[PDB]
């Protein structure tokens, strides 16, 4: 005897990956960015730049 045409379904699930990268900055310059350690000079301006 003959056969009937077949059917079928399916699913594929995802998977989780990630990227990351460190970006450390130091205290000596962190005091200069935020202006806390900033002094009123003509020399501290250049170090801030």
């Amino acid at each position: 005897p003959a056969d009937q045409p077949v059917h079928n379904y399916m699913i594929k699930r995802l998977d989780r990956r990630s990227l990351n990268a460190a970006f450390s900055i130091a205290v000596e310059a962190l005091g200069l960015i935020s202006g806390e350690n900033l002094d009123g000079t003509h020399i501290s301006s250049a170090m801030r730049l």
């Binding site: 000079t41 003509h42 020399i43 250049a46």
Partner: protein
């Protein structure tokens, strides 16, 4: 203070002289109050 001739000096070189403006202009031609005391 250090500015505009001693500034670049101390920044790139590492040293800075006191009376820089005078030596630069030379190389290339370019009230009180009273107080008591015991004298």
């Amino acid at each position: 203070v250090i500015a505009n001739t001693n500034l670049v000096t101390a920044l790139v070189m590492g040293k800075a002289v006191s009376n820089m403006d005078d030596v630069a202009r030379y190389l290339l031609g370019g009230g009180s109050a009273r107080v008591r005391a015991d004298l």
